[PDB]
Amino acid sequence: KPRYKDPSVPVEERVTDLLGRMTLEEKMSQLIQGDITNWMNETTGEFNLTGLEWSTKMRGGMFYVGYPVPWDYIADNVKKAQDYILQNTTLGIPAIVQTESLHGFLIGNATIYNSPIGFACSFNPELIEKMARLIGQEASALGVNHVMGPVVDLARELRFGRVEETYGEDPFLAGEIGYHYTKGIQSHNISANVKHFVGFSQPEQGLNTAPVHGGERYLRTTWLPSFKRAIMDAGAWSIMSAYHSYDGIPAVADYHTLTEILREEWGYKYWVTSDAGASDRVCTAFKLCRADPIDKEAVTLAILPAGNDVEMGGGSYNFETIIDLVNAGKLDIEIVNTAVSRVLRAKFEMGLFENPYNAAPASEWNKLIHTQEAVDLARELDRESIVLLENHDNALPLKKSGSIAVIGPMAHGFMNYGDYVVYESQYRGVTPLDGIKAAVGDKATINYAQGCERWSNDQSGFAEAVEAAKKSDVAVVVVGTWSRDQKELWAGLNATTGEHVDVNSLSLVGAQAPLIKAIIDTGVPTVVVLSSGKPITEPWLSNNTAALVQQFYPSEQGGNALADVLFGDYNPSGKLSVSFPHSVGDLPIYYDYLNSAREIGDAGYIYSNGTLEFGHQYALGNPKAWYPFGYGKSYSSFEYGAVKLDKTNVTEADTVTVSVDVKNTDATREGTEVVQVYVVDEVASVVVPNRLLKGFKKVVIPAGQTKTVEIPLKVQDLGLWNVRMKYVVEPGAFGVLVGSSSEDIRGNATFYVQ
Amino acid sequence: KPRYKDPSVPVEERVTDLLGRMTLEEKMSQLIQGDITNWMNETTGEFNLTGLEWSTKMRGGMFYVGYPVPWDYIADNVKKAQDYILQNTTLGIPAIVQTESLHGFLIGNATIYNSPIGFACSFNPELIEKMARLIGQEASALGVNHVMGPVVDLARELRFGRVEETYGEDPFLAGEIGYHYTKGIQSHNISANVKHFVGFSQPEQGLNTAPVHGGERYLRTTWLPSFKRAIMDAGAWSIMSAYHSYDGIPAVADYHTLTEILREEWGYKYWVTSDAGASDRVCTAFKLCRADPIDKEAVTLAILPAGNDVEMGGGSYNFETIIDLVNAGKLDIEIVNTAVSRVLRAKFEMGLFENPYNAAPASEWNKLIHTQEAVDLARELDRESIVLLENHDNALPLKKSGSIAVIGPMAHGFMNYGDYVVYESQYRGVTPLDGIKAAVGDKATINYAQGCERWSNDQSGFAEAVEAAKKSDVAVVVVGTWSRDQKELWAGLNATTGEHVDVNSLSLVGAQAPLIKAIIDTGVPTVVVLSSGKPITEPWLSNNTAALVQQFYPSEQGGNALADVLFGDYNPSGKLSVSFPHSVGDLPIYYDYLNSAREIGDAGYIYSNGTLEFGHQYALGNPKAWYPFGYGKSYSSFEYGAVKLDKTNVTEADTVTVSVDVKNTDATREGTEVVQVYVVDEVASVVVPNRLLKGFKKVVIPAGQTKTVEIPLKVQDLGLWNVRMKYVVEPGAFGVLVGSSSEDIRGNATFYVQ
Ligand SMILES: *[C@@H]1O[C@H](CO)[C@@H](O[C@@H]2O[C@H](CO)[C@@H](O)[C@H](O)[C@H]2NC(C)=O)[C@H](O)[C@H]1NC(C)=O
Ligand SMILES: *[C@@H]1O[C@H](CO)[C@@H](O[C@@H]2O[C@H](CO)[C@@H](O)[C@H](O)[C@H]2NC(C)=O)[C@H](O)[C@H]1NC(C)=O
Ligand SMILES: *[C@@H]1O[C@H](CO)[C@@H](O[C@@H]2O[C@H](CO)[C@@H](O)[C@H](O)[C@H]2NC(C)=O)[C@H](O)[C@H]1NC(C)=O
Ligand SMILES: *[C@@H]1O[C@H](CO)[C@@H](O[C@@H]2O[C@H](CO)[C@@H](O)[C@H](O)[C@H]2NC(C)=O)[C@H](O)[C@H]1NC(C)=O
Ligand SMILES: *[C@@H]1O[C@H](CO)[C@@H](O[C@@H]2O[C@H](CO)[C@@H](O)[C@H](O)[C@H]2NC(C)=O)[C@H](O)[C@H]1NC(C)=O
Ligand SMILES: *[C@@H]1O[C@H](CO)[C@@H](O[C@@H]2O[C@H](CO)[C@@H](O)[C@H](O)[C@H]2NC(C)=O)[C@H](O)[C@H]1NC(C)=O
Ligand SMILES: O[C@@H]1[C@@H](O)[C@@H](O)O[C@H](CO[C@H]2OC[C@@H](O)[C@H](O)[C@H]2O)[C@H]1O
Ligand SMILES: O[C@@H]1[C@@H](O)[C@@H](O)O[C@H](CO[C@H]2OC[C@@H](O)[C@H](O)[C@H]2O)[C@H]1O
Ligand SMILES: O[C@@H]1[C@@H](O)[C@H](O)O[C@H](CO[C@H]2OC[C@@H](O)[C@H](O)[C@H]2O)[C@H]1O
Ligand SMILES: O[C@@H]1[C@@H](O)[C@H](O)O[C@H](CO[C@H]2OC[C@@H](O)[C@H](O)[C@H]2O)[C@H]1O
Ligand SMILES: O[C@@H]1[C@@H](O)[C@H](O)O[C@H](CO[C@H]2OC[C@@H](O)[C@H](O)[C@H]2O)[C@H]1O
Ligand SMILES: O[C@@H]1[C@@H](O)[C@H](O)O[C@H](CO[C@H]2OC[C@@H](O)[C@H](O)[C@H]2O)[C@H]1O
Ligand SMILES: *[C@@H]1O[C@H](CO)[C@@H](O)[C@H](O)[C@H]1NC(C)=O
C-alpha cells in the first residue's frame, strides 16, 4: 500500500511519496500537454490504441479535448484514457482534461452565455458565480476536469481583438468577477486556469500578441490585481502564461513575475502552463535563440527555470530535451521536481486520485447539459448586461401595439455570438427579430428588413428598410461588429472582433452608419441597438436617435433578453465595463488614468454643417470618454442621500463601511441601480490613478421607495507601490466618491489613515 | 585677492573657494531663475533699478531674455545686469543669460532655419553644426550665453504637438544631430541645454505633458542614448528636466534618472534645471503634495535632492524655502552645496568669470545677425531636407517654360513657420509662390489660386483653382499643417501642430484634400507639396498625383529651397526622419519596433470603389508604414555593390568598418544618396529592437560614376540591457543591412562578436 494512494495522508506527503517513485521520463510526461486526437479520430470517432499508449507515455499529465465532435466521442475517449492510466501504468496518475469555458462549455449544443465584456456590465458577480457553476456542471458531465478561464486581462487597448473575452478595463471589477467565476468552476472540483499572465492585452498597435510597453509600477498597480484575487483568495489550481513580452521580457520566460511575484510574494502553490505554441515563440518571434532548426534546449532553459511548469501543444514540444539537459548537467533535477510537484499538488487537492472518473452516463447528458435552469440563467444574465446609453422623451420602453420596424444586418439571419463558440453555433439561438415577434405576438405589426450586409458598402437593401420604417410607428435598427466560431475564425472568414482580428477603426463598418442615417431621415422615432464585442465610435447617434442601447455579444437568449428591456418587462440595469471613446484617434480611454492625464486643455470640435472649432487637446477632437466606465441609465431615476462613513479616523487594519440611501423617484416601476464607490488617494509619494472603483452594489429598489446601500472598503487594499516598489498604505486623506458612473458622482466623504 | 578670481587655479579649487565665501541666501539665488522683465519694461524699454537689485539678490544665477522686443532692449539690459553683478555685489558671480535657439535665435529679424524634424531629413550633421555655430553668433551678439536646446526627444508619438521640435523617431540620428548641434553652440562658449530629460515625447493619448507608460529597459534602450551623446561626448554644460512622469515617477523628481544614471553612471559634471512651472506640478498635476496653498517645502524636498538643481520661473518659486528647510534640519546643506557647485563649475568652464561681457556693439549687430552666410546656409540646409516621396514618368524636375499653376493655402499669403518663432515672423520670408516666380522669371507663365483656407471646409475658391490648372501644362498644390509664433500660439489661435496643439487625426484638415482631388480630376499633371510639422495620412496621393514632395516646416528661404528642387537645380536628397503611417489608427509606427511587433498577419484593405477585403492585422487597415524611416527618392537611381567588412571575427573593443560601392546610374545628372546601415542583433538574451540605424553617410556621386562609401560601427554601441539591467555586448552574430532606407535594403554582411 503506497502512501500517495492514501487519502488520509497529508497532501505534501502524498506528493513527496509519488515524486520519489517516478522516472525522469514520467516527470517529463507530466509537464507536456497531450491531445485527445492522438487516439480519437476527429471525423469517425475511431480509437487508436497505439496513439493512446504513446500520448500517455510522452505527454500524459493533461490533454486538450476542444474539438467540434459529438458528446460521446469526448466522453468515451476521455474514459479510455483514464482507464488506461489506472490499469496499464505503474503509478496511475490521473489526467487533467482541458477545454474552453469562456462564456460557455465549448461543445456543440451546450449553453451559450453572453460574452465576458457584456456580463461584466451586469455588475452582478453572484449571478456570474451561478453561471460558472452551471458551466462546470455541463463540462463535468463529459469527463472534463479543467477549463481555460477565466480571462482576467483588462480591456485597456480597444483595437485588440480579444477585448470581448475580458471583464472590461478596471482592475477591481475584473478582479471580483474573476474570483466569483473561479470559485463557481472550482465548486465542482474542476480546475480553473487564470489567463493570460501577465500584462497581455495592451499590445503595440493593438495587434494580436504584439509586445507591451510598460513599467513595473503599472504592472503591479493595474495588471496583477485581477490575477491576485482569483489566485490567492479563490485558490485557482492553474494559471496560463501569455504570448507577449513586457518591457522586453517574454511572459513565458519572466522569472521576476512567474517566480518572485507569483510564488515568493503571493504563495502560489500550483502550476503555470504556456499558451499554445508560446514556448516556440521564444526563438521564432522574440529571437532569443536560433529558430531553424529550433533550439529546443534554449527554449526549455529560458521557460522552465523562470517558473513556467508545463508546455502546451501548438509548438515544437521543446520540453522533450528535459532528459538531455538534466544528463548534460545544464538543468538541475530540482527545477523539474518542483514543476512536477506543482502539477501533482493540484491533482491531489482536485480529488483526482480518489475519483478520477468524472463523466456521467450517456442517458443523463441531456439532463445535465443545456438544462432549463442554464438557459433561463443565460437570459437573466444577458438581460442584466444590457446598457441603456440614451432614451429621449420616453421613447423606451416601447408599447406592445401599433407597428414596429425591425431593421439591420444584426436583427436576423444569424446569431451575433462572440468568439469561443463551436462551429455552427450561429445557426441556433433567439435573434432580436425572434425576440420582438414573441414579445408582441398578435398585438403589434412587425415590419422586418435586413437593410445591408454587415460586410458590404452596398446600399441596394436600403429602400426596403426605409419603406419598413416609413409605414411603422417606431423603428429598431440592430447594427455592430461580428466575430467567428472556432472553425470559421481560423479559416480566415471575415470579422471585426475576436482572437487574431484587430481593428484600426472603431466606427461602424460598411453600410451600417448610412443605413441608420437613412432610417432617421424618415422622421420615424429610431432606436439603435449596438450588437458588438467592444466600443463603437458614432458620437452623432446620442442626440440624433430616440434611444441608443448596448448589448454586447449575446447569449443564446439574446433576443428575448433584448425584448425584455425594449418592452419594459425588465428595467435595464447595465453599467459600462469599458469606456467608449469619441474616436480611435483618442486612445487609450480608460477611466483610471494617472493624475496629469486626460484633463489638460480645451477640446476642439467638427460640426456636421462643416464648421471647425479649433482647440488644443485636441485641435479638432476630444480626449474625454464619449461614455465613461460605469455609465448606464434606467427607465427610473435615482436620488442619493448623504454619504455616511462608519469610521473617519482609521488604521490600515480597519474596514470603512460606506453607507448611502438611494431613492427610486419613479412612481410606476421598480428599478435597479449600481451604486459605485471610487477611492481617491488625495496626496501620494508617487503618481497614482486619479480614481479607482473599490466597491459597488447592485440594488433593486421598489417604485417610490428608498433603499440603504452599504459597501465595505478594506483599507489594506487602497495603497500604492512606492519609489522602492513596496506596497504601502500611506497615512493621509482618502476621498470616497459615490456615484451612478465613474464621472456621475452624487456624494462624497473623506477618511484619514493614521 | 581671492583664488576663485584666478584663471590659473583649476576649476574644482575655484568652485571650492567661491562656495566657501557664499551665504545660504547667495546659494539660493544661484538655483532660482530670474527674468529680464524684472528690470526691463517689455513695451517701453524703461529700466527699473529696484527690480534689478531684487532679481540679482533672490534669483540672479541665471535669467530669461526670450521676449519679442528690439535688439537694444536685450543688449542694454543684459549689460546692466552683468555691470551690476561685477560692480555692486560682493562676489561678482556672472549671470547665465537664457533664450531659445531651436531652429533660429528667438528674436525679431534673425535667421530662421527649417524646423528640426525637417533638417533631420538632411542626414547632414556637419551642416547642422555649421547652423548651430551661426546661431551661436547671432545670440552672442546681444549678450546671450545659454540656449534652451537641442531637443533630443524622439518622435515616437505622432499625435504630440512637438514632433516638429525633435530630430525624428530614431535614437542614433537624434544622438548624432544633437551632438553636432551641441558642439556648434558650445564652440562660442554658449551653454547648450539638452531637453527634455527623459522619456517626454510619448504622452498618453498624445496630449501635451500627459504621463508616459514604459519600463526601464525601454528608457535605457531608446530614450537615454540621444541625451548620452550630447551630454558625455559633446560636453553639454546644462540639462532641462521634463514635465512628465515615466511609469509614475515625475521626471523633475526622479532620483534614479537624475542622480544614479546621470551622475553615478555617466559622470555628468554640470547642472539640471526644471522646465517652466514643472516644480509646481509636483503638487498641482501629480498630486504628490497639497496644491492650495502649495507646499513649497514638499516641492523643494521632492526635486532638489533628486538631482534637479535649478528651479525655472513660471511657477511659485518653491526653492525660496531652501533656507527654511536647512534651518529645520530637513534639507542637508551639502545637497544645496552640490547643486550650486554644479552651476558654478559650468560658469567657470564657459569662461564667464574671465569674459562676463558677450555683446558686440550696436553698430556691429547688422553684420552678425541675418548675414548672407546664415541666410544662404538656411537655404542649403532646407533644400537638403526636402524629401521626394513619388515622381511618376519624370514629372519632376519641371521645365522652366510653358504654363505653371501654383495652388493651395500654403503656396502664398503667409509663411508656414513652425513653433519657436517670434511674433510676426510669418510676414517675412520666401513663400513657394515667391520662389517659383524667381526661378522661371519670364520664361514661364505662373497662374496663382489660393484654392481654400487651411482652417475652413468652404470650397468657394475651387473654381478659380480648377481654372488656373486647366490653362497650365502642370500644377503645383501646396497644402499641409500649420503652427503659430510664440504670442499667437499662447493667445489661443488655431493650429494643427506646435507646443500644446495635439491632434487625434493626421489626415489633411479642412478643404485641402478635396482641393487636391478637384485639381487632379482636371486631367492636368498634379504635383503635391506637403508643408508640415509631422506625418500626414493620405495614402491615395501616392498613385493619383504625378509627384509627391515633403517639405517639413520651411526656413525663411523655403520657397527658393523648394523651387531649387522642383526645377532641378538641386537633385533632392532628403530621407525621412520619421515614419508615415496609413492612418492615426495605426500608431505607433516607429521602424525600430521590438521583435514580435508589426509583422504579424495579413492586412485588409478598403478600395476607393467601396469594396472591402477583410484581413486580420488589421481587419480593414495596414500596420506597416506608408513611408518608412529613411525613405527618400532622387532624380537619379543608385546601384549598390557588394557590402564588405574590414573585420569579420571581432571583440567588444574593435570597430567594424562597412564599405560599399554605389553607382549613380543617371547619365545626365549628379545625385546625392544617403547610404544607411542597420544592425540586427540576431539572437539576444532579452527582446531587442528588430533593426537599428547605427551609421549612415551622405555622398554626392557624379553622373554615371561610382563612389566607395565607408561607415564605421563601434561594437561597444551595439549592446542591450540584459535581464539584470546591465549593458552588455553579447557574443554572437550581428547582421549588417545596407540600404537606401530602413525597408529598402540593397546588400548585407555578418560579423561575429567573440
Ligand atoms: C496511431 O498513433 C501513432 C502515434 O502514436 C501514429 O504513428 C505516427 O505516424 C506518423 C505518420 O505521419 C509518424 O510521423 C510518427 O512518427 C508516428 N509516431 C508514432 C509514435 O507512432 C499512427 O499513425 C496512428 N494510426 C492511426 C491509424 O491513426
Ligand atoms: C472535491 O474533492 C475533495 C477531495 O477528494 C472531496 O472532499 C472529500 O470527500 C470525501 C467524501 O467522498 C470525504 O470523506 C473527505 O474528507 C473529503 N476530503 C477533503 C480534503 O475535503 C469533495 O467531496 C469533492 N467535492 C465535490 C463537489 O465533488
Ligand atoms: C464575409 O463572409 C460571408 C460568409 O459568412 C461571405 O458570404 C458568402 O460568399 C459566398 C461567395 O464567396 C457565397 O457562395 C455564400 O453563399 C455567401 N454567404 C452568405 C451568408 O452570404 C461574404 O461574401 C464575406 N464578405 C467579404 C467581403 O469577404
Ligand atoms: C520695480 O521692481 C519691483 C520689484 O522689486 C516692483 O515692486 C513690486 O510691486 C508689485 C506691485 O504690482 C508687488 O506685487 C510686488 O510685491 C513688489 N515687489 C517688491 C519686492 O517690492 C516695482 O513695482 C517695479 N516697478 C516698476 C516696473 O515700475
Ligand atoms: C572659451 O572660454 C575659455 C575659458 O575662458 C577660453 O580659453 C582661454 O583663453 C585664454 C586667452 O584668451 C588662454 O590663454 C587660456 O589658456 C584659455 N583657457 C582655457 C582653459 O582654455 C576660450 O578662448 C573661449 N573661447 C572662445 C571662442 O571665446
Ligand atoms: C483661424 O485664425 C485666423 C487668423 O490667422 C482667423 O482669421 C482672422 O479672423 C478674424 C475674425 O475673427 C479677422 O479679424 C482676421 O482678418 C482674419 N485673418 C485672416 C488672415 O483671414 C480665422 O477665423 C481662424 N479660424 C477659426 C475657424 O478659428
Ligand atoms: O425614460 C427615463 C426617464 O423616465 C427618466 O427617468 O430619465 C431616464 C434617463 O434619461 C436621461 O439620460 C439619458 C438621456 O438619453 C435623456 O435625455 C435623459 O433625460 C430615462 O431613461
Ligand atoms: O525621375 C526619376 C527617374 O530618373 C528614375 O531614376 O527613378 C527615380 C525613382 O522613381 C521610382 O520611385 C518613385 C516612384 O514615384 C516612381 O514611379 C519609381 O519609378 C525617379 O525620381
Ligand atoms: O447526442 C447529443 C445530443 O443529445 C445533443 O442535443 O446534441 C449533441 C451535439 O450534436 C449536434 O450538434 C453538433 C454536431 O457535432 C453534431 O453532428 C450534431 O448532431 C449530440 O452529441
Ligand atoms: O486563450 C488561449 C489562446 O491565447 C490560444 O491561442 O489558444 C488557447 C487554446 O489552445 C488549445 O488549442 C490549440 C492547441 O494547439 C492547444 O494545445 C490547446 O490547448 C487559448 O486557451
Ligand atoms: O534695429 C533692429 C533692426 O536692425 C533689425 O533688423 O530688426 C530688429 C527687430 O525689430 C522689429 O522686430 C521686433 C520688434 O520688437 C521691433 O519693434 C520691430 O521693429 C531691430 O531691433
Ligand atoms: O521647451 C521648454 C518648454 O517645455 C516650456 O513650456 O517653455 C520653456 C521656456 O520657458 C521660458 O518661458 C516661460 C518662462 O516662465 C520661463 O521662465 C522661461 O525660461 C521651453 O524651453
Ligand atoms: C480518420 O479516419 C479517416 C479514414 O477512416 C482518415 O481519412 C483520417 O485521416 C483519419 N485520421 C487519423 C489521424 O488517423
Ligand SMILES: *[C@@H]1O[C@H](CO)[C@@H](O)[C@H](O)[C@H]1NC(C)=O
Ligand atoms: C490493461 O490491463 C488489464 C490487465 O489488468 C488488461 O486486461 C487490459 O487488456 C490492459 N489494456 C491495455 C490497453 O493495455
Ligand SMILES: *[C@@H]1O[C@H](CO)[C@@H](O)[C@H](O)[C@H]1NC(C)=O
Ligand atoms: C447630447 O446633448 C446633451 C444635452 O444637450 C449633451 O450634454 C451631450 O453632450 C450631447 N452628446 C453628444 C455626443 O453630442
Ligand SMILES: *[C@@H]1O[C@H](CO)[C@@H](O)[C@H](O)[C@H]1NC(C)=O
Ligand atoms: C454651423 O454650426 C454652428 C453652430 O453654432 C455655427 O457657428 C455656424 O454659423 C453654422 N454654419 C453654417 C454655415 O450654418
Ligand SMILES: *[C@@H]1O[C@H](CO)[C@@H](O)[C@H](O)[C@H]1NC(C)=O
Ligand atoms: C478625526 O480626527 C481629527 C483629529 O484632529 C478630529 O478633529 C475629528 O474630530 C475626528 N473625527 C471624528 C468623527 O471622530
Ligand SMILES: *[C@@H]1O[C@H](CO)[C@@H](O)[C@H](O)[C@H]1NC(C)=O
Ligand atoms: C511699461 O510702461 C507703461 C507706461 O509707461 C505702463 O503702463 C506699463 O504697465 C509698463 N509695463 C510693465 C509690464 O510694467
Ligand SMILES: *[C@@H]1O[C@H](CO)[C@@H](O)[C@H](O)[C@H]1NC(C)=O
Ligand atoms: C555700483 O558701483 C559703483 C561704485 O563702484 C557706483 O558708482 C554705482 O553707483 C553702483 N551702482 C548701483 C546701481 O548701485
Ligand SMILES: *[C@@H]1O[C@H](CO)[C@@H](O)[C@H](O)[C@H]1NC(C)=O
Ligand atoms: C502605388 O503603386 C506601387 C507600384 O505598383 C505599389 O507598390 C504601392 O504599394 C502603391 N502605393 C499605394 C499607397 O497605394
Ligand SMILES: *[C@@H]1O[C@H](CO)[C@@H](O)[C@H](O)[C@H]1NC(C)=O
Ligand atoms: C472594385 O474594385 C475591385 C478591384 O479589384 C474589383 O474586384 C471590384 O469588382 C470593383 N467593384 C465593383 C462593384 O465591380
Ligand SMILES: OC[C@H]1O[C@@H](O)[C@H](O)[C@@H](O)[C@@H]1O
Ligand atoms: O497558430 C496558433 C493558433 O492556431 C490555431 O489552430 C489554434 O486554434 C489557436 O488557438 C492557436 O493559437
Ligand SMILES: [Ca+2]
Ligand atoms: Ca495619501
Ligand SMILES: [Ca+2]
Ligand atoms: Ca546576439
